[PDB]
Amino acid sequence: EFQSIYSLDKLYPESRGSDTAWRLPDDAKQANDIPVDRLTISYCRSSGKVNSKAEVRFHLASADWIAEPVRLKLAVKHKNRINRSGELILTSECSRYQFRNLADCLQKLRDMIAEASQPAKEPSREDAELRRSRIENMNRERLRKKRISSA
């Protein structure tokens, strides 16, 4: 009941009730990204370097929280991470605390969706291995140029 000139009520007159600080503004952010209730989270701890492997597995085809063009672009780019049964698998090993490992997976998943969502997002790059890959691809096309009746 004690009040001073530096109390929160007298410093921020707009909010005075003690219940204001504990409200849940669901309307402010209605996007509701990554509904983790439908994500399969598995923890596997390796103790010896101690780390907690946190993996996020979900069905890409039935994931309805992403758009149809975004859903198929994930399969085109990230086809290396897709399991046989269509389960996209994401794994992290950075931190020892599994809270940070799961947070890293969610942030990594957001970046995968964000760049695939944009139709105009199509960055390119040049790498040291790209040079020899282009050369070995160009060289195998030299022998392919012959065109005679096949089997």
Partner: protein, 288 residues
């Protein structure tokens, strides 16, 4: 149990005539008498060794000493003014609760931790409180309303997962000495003084809502809490619907030290009574 007590019946009575110290506890002293420790007494032969006039410690005989040929650099520059925070781990916080050292039914602050022998705070050695670390965030299943002087992102997220409340408050060394040892203060016969404001250096830490500062604007707490829930992927509990909401919402005025007490009150522990001032100037000074 003690089968040696059976042996004591046969043996004679224990008195001052037959007592022996534990063997090895008292190494005998060696005196410089005899052929062995004699004619030199373990000193040497001539010089500054036998005459006991060797130079000071760190003097290498005219040559520049090792501790004088190293350039000065500031490693301890202003160390007596740097703030120190005793770390508290969630593994220890869980350990205290399981053994009844502290209870989550009652709000927990720095005073309750000291009485529970969880952490020891020395105000003299520039200690400004307790910082919450995230060593045991994975196995923390308790629900508490804890108030500390510094918190980490993972420590706050771990507590809010179970539905707790974390708040950071600043304590001046004059006030922190009173807070850690309240009973000795009440025996000094002095009015409870106002808690001082944080210095300009520590204003941003306790004003931003990311650190759950005590001086922060309460309107930005709910949006900041949900950001942590989104970041770490845990559903944010609705704390207003729990039966302990009254206990979990308890806070302190920035000018207030203890729960329910006010500056200017004198606690007469002998008579179990609380004294309050009446003059307008006294009330204004202790409430401004």
């Amino acid at each position: 149990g003690p089968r040696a007590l059976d042996l004591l019946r046969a043996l004679p009575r224990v008195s001052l005539a037959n007592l022996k110290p534990n063997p090895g506890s008292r190494k005998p002293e060696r005196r410089p008498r005899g052929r062995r420790r004699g004619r030199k007494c373990g000193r040497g032969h001539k010089g500054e060794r036998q005459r006991g006039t060797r130079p000071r410690l760190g003097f290498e005989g005219g040559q520049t000493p090792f501790y004088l040929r190293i350039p000065k650099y500031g490693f301890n520059e202003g160390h007596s003014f740097r703030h120190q925070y005793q770390p508290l781990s969630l593994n220890r916080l869980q350990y205290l609760i399981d053994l009844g050292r502290v209870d989550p039914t009652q709000p927990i602050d720095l005073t309750q931790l000291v009485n529970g022998r969880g952490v020891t705070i020395q105000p003299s050695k520039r200690d400004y409180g307790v910082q919450l670390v995230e060593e045991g965030a994975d196995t923390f299943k308790a629900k508490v309303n804890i108030e500390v002087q510094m918190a980490s992102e993972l420590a706050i997220a771990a507590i809010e997962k179970n539905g707790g409340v974390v708040t950071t408050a600043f304590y001046d060394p004059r006030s922190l000495e009173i807070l850690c040892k309240p009973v000795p203060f009440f025996l000094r016969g002095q009015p409870i003084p106002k808690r001082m404001l944080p210095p300009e250096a520590l204003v941003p830490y306790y004003t931003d809502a990311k650190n759950r500062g005590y001086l922060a604007d309460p309107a930005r707490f709910p949006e900041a809490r949900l950001e942590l829930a989104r970041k770490y992927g845990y559903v944010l509990p609705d704390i207003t619907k729990d039966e302990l909401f009254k206990m979990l919402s308890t806070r302190k005025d920035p000018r207030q030290i203890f729960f329910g007490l006010a500056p200017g009150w004198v606690v007469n522990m002998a008579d179990k009574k609380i004294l309050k001032p009446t003059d307008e100037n006294l009330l204004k000074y202790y409430s401004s």
